[PDB]
Design a protein around this ligand. Sequence first.
Ligand SMILES: C=CCO[C@]1(C(=O)O)C[C@@H](O[C@@]2(C(=O)O)O[C@H]([C@H](O)CO)[C@H](O)[C@H](O)[C@@H]2O)[C@@H](O)[C@@H]([C@H](O)CO)O1
Ligand SMILES: [Mg+2]
Ligand SMILES: [Zn+2]
Lengths: 217, 222
Amino acid sequence: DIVMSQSPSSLAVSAGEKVTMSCKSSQSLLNSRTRKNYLAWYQQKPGQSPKLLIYWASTRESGVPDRFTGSGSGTDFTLTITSVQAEDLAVYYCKQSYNLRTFGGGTKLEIKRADAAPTVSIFPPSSEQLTSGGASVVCFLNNFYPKDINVKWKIDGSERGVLNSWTDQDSKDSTYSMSSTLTLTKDEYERHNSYTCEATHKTSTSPIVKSFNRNEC
Amino acid sequence: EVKLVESGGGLVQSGGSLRLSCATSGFTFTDYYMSWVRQPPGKALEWLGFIRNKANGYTTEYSPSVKGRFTISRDNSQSILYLQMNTLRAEDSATYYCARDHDGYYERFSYWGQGTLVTVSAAKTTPPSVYPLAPGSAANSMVTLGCLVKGYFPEPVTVTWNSGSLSSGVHTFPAVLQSDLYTLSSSVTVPSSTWPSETVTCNVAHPASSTKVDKKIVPRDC
Ligand SMILES: C=CCO[C@]1(C(=O)O)C[C@@H](O[C@@]2(C(=O)O)O[C@H]([C@H](O)CO)[C@H](O)[C@H](O)[C@@H]2O)[C@@H](O)[C@@H]([C@H](O)CO)O1
Ligand SMILES: [Mg+2]
Ligand SMILES: [Zn+2]
């Protein structure tokens, strides 16, 4: 086979800086007849299909910003991004087409930005859910940076059936968001009053506390 | 303009078969090789095979990984590409893409479809419960609302807000699997002068169960 390998697995760069990533083939990709390297670069943004960026190692596809440059030959190739933009968040794949086709494993590119505190919102169970015997309490912790965050649930002042989910980094502001869902039975829900989402993030030594009381609903 | 549209993905049991389609338009179909590529959730792209153009006798080639088990064909009268998959296993669960390939000159995959998600599993299809997330009767310039999309199988689900007219300030959280069912949520943040003044509705679809739901976010009082 031809084996394709990329490095790094992942990195993060601040907007305006240069990015360099690497792609190795187990065999030269230099076609002797055409004198081109059959190596392409693809960009895959979160939730999207892959998009062609570069082909024949160095040819930039139309529509592709000039900040993206492919170089290299034979077994070693480079994609360079100058003046990186928030929207450049993506996994980048190289692909050989010298002998059928094979993809490398990708390089994830993330964006570094200023620390940003989360915006925290809490939501009681809906009457439509409670009618069926269940009670989900939801907390969104939105548009923060860096990604590391700690959430705890407290019920009547005591720490406590939790689903956590993080978004991919945002293409526009380079922040992260997380959702935490605590699910109880209706009967257990109705035994307590105070429901609290507590978020601890590096941006404050004070946790962000959002709470509601079942009695006030 | 060029269009590639996959269909046929969904839920299938281990050992089962499935055939995907990829309808195309806006280029001369017969001039082009066509490839299939897949991607398991959170993993790398994997090339599966191609079918050559008219000049090359529409012949097929396959990755060693799926040769003998998958078959590619094309309908040149309708510009549609097919992928027949047999003896499916959990490892075949993936997003499947078609891509326009070689034209005899350029080495590149110029265009890709949106992808179709295949899930290989014994689990039954379960439609989601969709619940509104409205600030409580005690909860400021901006306001955050949401929908909880709970307890469905297989992926995927789509969520939009006001039929896609609200797209800025949306966070749709990746689904998490917990005892055999997925749950996801979506938030939208709007000016507080605009809700409940103006309507906010999440539109949720679950193709596997043909579920279509619009859920209006109603204020607690009001
Ligand atoms: C029926 C095929 C013929 O052959 C080729 C040739 O010059 O050998 C190759 C064709 O391209 C492929 C292919 O096998 O279909 O192989 C090339 C490889 O470099 C050999 O040249 C690339 O891997 C390419 O992407 C294809 O995978 C094709 O270029 C063909 C041409 O259309 C002549 O009519 O000639
Ligand atoms: Mg208890
Ligand atoms: Zn052959």
